[PDB]
Each structure stands twice: as structure tokens, then as C-alpha cells.
Design a protein around this ligand. Structure first.
Ligand SMILES: CCOc1ccc2nc(S(N)(=O)=O)sc2c1
Ligand SMILES: CCOc1ccc2nc(S(N)(=O)=O)sc2c1
Ligand SMILES: [Cl-]
Ligand SMILES: [Cl-]
Ligand SMILES: [Zn+2]
Ligand SMILES: [Zn+2]
Lengths: 212, 223
């Protein structure tokens, strides 16, 4: 059984062999990239939303097909949000104590994932509805203006399927220290961060968008 | 047994011939593709060429292409990492399609660095003027005369850069592609001969599935 306990994922199932063999496995440290000033091309179609279900090695909140992201002429339906502690993706070796992943699928079956860091500070109201289920302020969840990193990668969890479009947001969200240990407690006080995977000089663009 | 013919050994079946080749199917950054969506970028000038005229170690037909091997004298520098041009080979038509445009021919500059990491540079050809750069080879397949590598490429190039795979089995990924937009020119006769030297047998992998590849457009000076 696969866990984060103390590189052998490929062994447990042959379905997981790509975890080693893939040349574009995630997460990574974002250190070399291209600046661009091209249109967002990223449109959010988010609303405050109450979960299809809320359940637990990571804390996950799933949703109905109500929230969308449209990228270069294709609609990606929001499936779920889950957390990693520490932040899996590194930005020039800076990681945040917590992260969230927003998972999407298009007509063609393609995957798009949204990642953002958290900053230890003020209480974050967006977390509480989940922590009948209370609705989550998605369209308000995200920063107004985001600087993001976009590149190609894999699932950070098995089967580590690749073909994932990652957009990693620069801005850290804020989380209070009680909330942090609580979710950390919520995840059995067991870390669920895959280490940085081998990076074969991934082509990375830095760009921005308006989430709302 | 892989080939480009429509029988059991074509591209739609390359994954079946050897288990070493399955990434041809399962791989998620498979090349070639149609380059139409990309990001325009600051021209930080990432790529530096260091080519000289060079005589081929060998010029020979292998695995459907005309290949010219070289001593490790011609190089490319990318973000402070140097890749040695290993060989130049040909595909007809051009395999990468640029904004849905297909060219009669392309040339691939295969580079490998110390780590065994791969870099390939592609430039297309369309029918026109006689190319003196080409002729050493068409005769050389039949010592070898040197190739004006330093003179081969356009002075300033527009190219697309992304991560992809090899276009022939084993279809290895982690390949850094530099696809130059500018077409070089070839005479209609030279064109017909290259195809004859490459046996009038197509050696173009079809466009492969695209998983939203991040492509940047930039430019450089080859001279
Ligand atoms: C039905 C199985 O769905 C799975 C399994 C692993 C997995 N990892 C992500 S992530 N952390 O965004 O890269 S999403 C996902 C979905
Ligand atoms: C080890 C044998 O060398 C091989 C096998 C396939 C292959 N495809 C290219 S290409 N068409 O530039 O992407 S180069 C190359 C070298
Ligand atoms: Cl993350
Ligand atoms: Cl090509
Ligand atoms: Zn995740
Ligand atoms: Zn080739």
C-alpha cells in the first residue's frame, strides 16, 4: 500500500512504474522560466459551492460539475480540491506549509491542475465551510490577480499519470496557525508531500490572469 | 522491425513491435505535433551556436533517413549547458507542423550532452534555389567533403521550444525541441534525389496526441 512514509511507488503496482520512468513527473522546483506578456487565456467559471462529498492520505473536498475553467477553447470541469503539506512545488526553493489542488477534466479527457501556497497568518474564512455540508466560496477562494506558473507535469499521486497541465500560483493565501495544525492533524499529522521529482529542464512560462 | 509502411510495422503499431517502444503509445509528450498555440517571450537570448564547417565521420542510410555523423567539433549552448551536434538527418515531409503548415523536408540536429540528455533542432525545406550546403552530402553518400555547418542555418532564426519525444522508435521523452520557423531552400532536383537516397519511402511520423504542450516562441543568431 502506497503512502508518504519514510521512491518505491513504482514497485507496488506496475501501473505505477511511470513514477520512475516518466521524464515529466511532478512536483518540481520552479527555478528557470520564460516571462511572457500574452493574454490570460485562462478563464474561471467559479461559484460558491457546496461539496458532492467531503472525505479523507489527503484531505479532499469533491464537487459536482458546477465549476469550470476554460483554457484555449476547451472547458475543464472542476472535480475536487485536496491539500499537501508541505507545498509540493518549489518556487526557487521556496515552499509553503500548505497547498491546495484544483482538479479538472475536458472533453478529450485531458487534466488541468491548480496549485497555490498558503501563508501562516490571518484566519482564512474559505476553509471553514468544509472544516449537508457548508458551501465553499470558490470564486472568492482565489486571489484577484494571480501570477502563475504554467508547465506540463504528472499527477503527484499514483498512477502519476502524465499529461497534466499545472498552473502554479505565486501568491500565497493566508492560513492561521491553529487551522494549519488542525488540517495537519486532519491528515493524521502525517505529511503528504511527494518530494521534488527529477526535472529535465521543463519549459516553464510565467504569466498572469484575472481569476475574477 | 519498425518502418513507416501501412503494414503491421507502421507507427500506429510501433508500440507492438518491442516493449522498449511502448512509450510511443503511452507517452504523454510525444513528437511531432502541430505548433499553433504558444507563448511569445522576452528574447533573453538563451541559445548560442558554435558551428564550424565539418567533414562527416560517416554519411549513410540507417532507419529510413540520410544520416551524417560528426566528430564532436560543432556545438550548441543552451542556458549555460552545451550540447554536441551528433548528427544531421532528414525527414520528408517535415515532421513538425508549424501553424498547421507542412513542408516537403526537414533536417534534424541531434545533440546529446554529457548527461545523455537529448536536444534536437528542426528546420524545414521548401522547393527553390539550389542549396550548396546540401550538395556535399548527396555526393558524399556515393574521404567525405566537409559540411558548412557554420553556414547551414539562417543568420537569425525564429524557433519554437518545448519538451517532447524522439520521432522514431524508441520514442524517448525528455527531448528538448527547437523547431525553427524559417524554411531553408532546396532545388526540385535535389529534393527528388534526397528522397531517392532515402529510398522514395516516406519517413514522417504522423502528428501525435497533444497534452497542452507549453511552447514558447523566441529567436537567435546562428552566426
Ligand atoms: C481516481 C484517482 O484519482 C487520482 C489519483 C491521484 C491523484 N493526484 C492528483 S494531484 N495531487 O493533483 O496531482 S489528482 C489525483 C486523482
Ligand atoms: C539509439 C539510436 O538513435 C536513435 C533512435 C531514434 C531516433 N529519433 C531521432 S529524431 N527523428 O530526431 O527525433 S534521433 C534518434 C536516434
Ligand atoms: Cl500544491
Ligand atoms: Cl520535423
Ligand atoms: Zn494533490
Ligand atoms: Zn529525425
Amino acid at each position: 500500500k502506497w503512502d508518504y512514509k519514510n521512491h518505491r511507488w513504482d514497485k507496488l503496482h506496475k501501473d505505477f512504474e511511470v513514477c520512475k520512468s516518466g521524464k515529466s513527473q511532478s512536483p518540481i522546483n520552479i527555478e528557470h522560466y520564460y516571462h511572457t506578456q500574452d493574454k490570460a487565456d485562462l478563464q474561471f467559471k467559479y461559484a460558491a459551492s457546496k461539496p458532492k462529498a467531503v472525505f479523507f492520505h489527503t484531505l479532499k473536498a469533491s464537487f459536482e460539475p458546477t465549476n469550470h475553467i476554460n483554457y484555449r477553447g476547451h472547458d475543464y470541469v472542476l472535480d475536487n480540491v485536496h491539500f499537501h503539506a508541505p507545498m509540493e512545488f518549489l518556487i526557487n526553493n521556496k515552499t509553503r506549509p500548505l497547498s491546495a489542488h484544483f482538479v479538472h477534466k475536458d472533453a478529450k479527457g485531458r487534466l488541468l491542475v491548480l496549485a497555490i501556497g498558503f501563508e501562516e497568518g490571518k484566519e482564512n474564512p474559505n476553509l471553514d465551510p468544509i472544516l449537508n455540508f457548508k458551501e465553499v466560496a470558490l470564486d472568492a477562494f482565489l486571489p484577484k490577480s494571480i501570477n502563475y506558473y504554467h508547465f506540463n507535469g504528472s499527477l503527484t499521486a499514483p498512477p502519476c499519470t502524465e499529461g497534466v497541465a499545472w498552473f502554479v500560483i505565486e501568491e500565497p493565501l493566508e492560513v492561521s496557525a491553529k487551522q494549519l495544525a488542525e488540517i495537519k492533524k486532519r491528515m493524521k499529522n502525517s505529511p503528504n508531500q511527494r518530494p521534488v521529482q527529477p526535472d529535465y529542464n521543463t519549459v516553464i512560462i510565467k504569466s498572469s490572469a484575472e481569476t475574477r
